[PDB]
Homo-oligomer: A and B are copies of this chain.
Amino acid sequence: AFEEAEKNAPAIIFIDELDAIAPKREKTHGEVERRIVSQLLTLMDGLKQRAHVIVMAATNRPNSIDPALRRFGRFDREVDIGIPDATGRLEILQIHTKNMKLADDVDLEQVANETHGHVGADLAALCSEAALQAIRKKMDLIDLEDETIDAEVMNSLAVTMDDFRWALSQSNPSALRETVVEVPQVTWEDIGGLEDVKRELQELVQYPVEHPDKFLKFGMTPSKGVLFYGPPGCGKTLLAKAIANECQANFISIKGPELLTMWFGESEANVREIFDKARQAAPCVLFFDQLDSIAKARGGNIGDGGGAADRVINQILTEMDGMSTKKNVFIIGATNRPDIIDPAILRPGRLDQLIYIPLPDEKSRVAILKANLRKSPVAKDVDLEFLAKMTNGFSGADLTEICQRACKLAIRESIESEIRRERERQPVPEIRRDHFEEAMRFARRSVSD
């Protein structure tokens, strides 16, 4: 290959998937692979003397390459093809939409702004999905078992902004296909109370991404971490669900102990990969449910899993300190017992913002009851204000249990009624006071003094 390049000069050699034939020689068990790496080093050394030959290489694992291949004279120049910003996304969309016939309705600027973590392959997939949605819209007129398509259908075929909106709804970056989870649809209106907490959350995410330069002008850096601590059932996870749906950023949700692995070095690699995954999709929200599982006080016991429990938290601190400035990764940790959280996790520069989600007061409990019953048919005589004052120490989940218990009693009454109606052959339009009254007697308080 190198000789053919030298014979026809000037020449370009493109080695695609370089890491396939350029692993680290120390890590390589095979003899042929090591001989190939050494041959590549020799070929590059002779290439420096060779006339007008350029070697280009592409790889998505630059760290896997042998370090000697990245010295001076061998691949000395490295170009980072990163994730595009809004204007780059607009350019990619314009490139991929030039051959596609679009209606005047479509606005590529909105689509460019709404795809936060896309790399360009994701944008091409979005365009293809929008065109396929248009074809689906015409699939009512034209069916698959047809000999030909009418020319009127061909002329009427076009891609509108609605198809692009559908594609955006289905759109997700390919980086985050491993981390995607099915999150319930939770609007900010589903959360009752916590009005000040909602305002703090929206400003802590929107301001750093929307207006970076003002922080530079005022000589201050935005906080990159928020800790949710409070009694169980008061809405720490529910706030994360609302952010995942309503906040205009990518979301990565992490179950606490899912990162840890029995194999040596795998637990720290998973932490390193998950932070790198969020950085590729910035602005991204990295959420740790039950943070005390991974972020626990070091030195709790000698009999650790080979010390791996203490290494993972060290890797987390290393990852948080590495990321800063233009990278926009908000790390949100929800902890149920914040006292067992390791203090280094809460120090300035790492999750320094601490938000307390308390037991709802009387006014909040009215909002919680209204939010749970917003979609539910309830009798007007039911006084939710009265329930709030009698449910003195009830949490958000305690109040939701009351509503669910009242629903079940209403369901129970209707079922015995439909059984009775079938019997006389051979009701319960809404939840009433008595259903709430009987449900209130089973009600308990879960958070104690």
A182 to chain B, nearest CB (A): 5
A442 to chain B, nearest CB (A): 8
Set B31, B218, B306: member contacting A407, Cβ < 8 A: B218
8 more A-B residue pairs beyond the given contacts A71-B121, A214-B415, A292-B310, with a C-beta to C-beta distance below 8 A: A23-B31, A29-B31, A218-B411, A219-B377, A222-B408, A260-B268, A262-B264, A348-B401
- Assembly of this chain: how many copies? 4
Chain B residues with Cβ below 8 Å from A182 are: 324-325
Interface residue? A116 (CB, 8 A): no
Q: Which residues of chain A in 434-449 are interfacial with respect to chain B, using CB atoms and an 8 Å cutoff?
A: 442, 444, 446-448
B267 A261 Cβ-Cβ under 8 A: no
- Listed A/B pairs (22) with beta-carbon separation below 8 Å: A19-B38, A25-B61, A60-B68, A67-B175, A211-B411, A217-B377, A218-B431, A219-B375, A256-B315, A257-B311, A260-B265, A264-B305, A264-B308, A289-B323, A293-B314, A299-B339, A299-B340, A301-B306, A348-B397, A348-B398, A348-B401, A352-B397
B352 A321 Cβ-Cβ under 8 A: no
Per-position 1/0 for A17-58, Cβ under 8 A of B: 101110101111111011101110110001100000000000
A313 to chain B, nearest CB (A): 8
A119 to chain B, nearest CB (A): 8
The 6 closest A-B pairs by CB, nearest first: A264-B305, A304-B306, A72-B125, A293-B314, A20-B38, A257-B268
Chain B residues with Cβ below 8 Å from A324 are: 181-183
Chain B residues with Cβ below 8 Å from A392 are: none
Interface residue? A347 (CB, 8 A): yes
Chain B residues with Cβ below 8 Å from A307 are: 296, 300-301, 304, 309
